[PDB]
Design a protein around this ligand. Structure first.
Ligand code: ZN
Length: 42
């Protein structure tokens, strides 16, 4: 959780909407969005 201590990462996934400090991190993350289709309780 976050309230107001640090800033906000520039890169932000589009599939789920996550955030990443470094681009590379995202490029690799986006991959995870290549199967998970079924529902998920949070
Ligand atoms: Zn994502």
């Amino acid at each position: 959780g976050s309230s107001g201590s640090s800033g906000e990462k520039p890169y932000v996934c589009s599939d789920c909407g996550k955030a990443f400090t470094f681009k590379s991190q995202l490029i690799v993350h986006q991959g995870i969005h290549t199967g998970v289709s079924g529902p998920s309780s949070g």
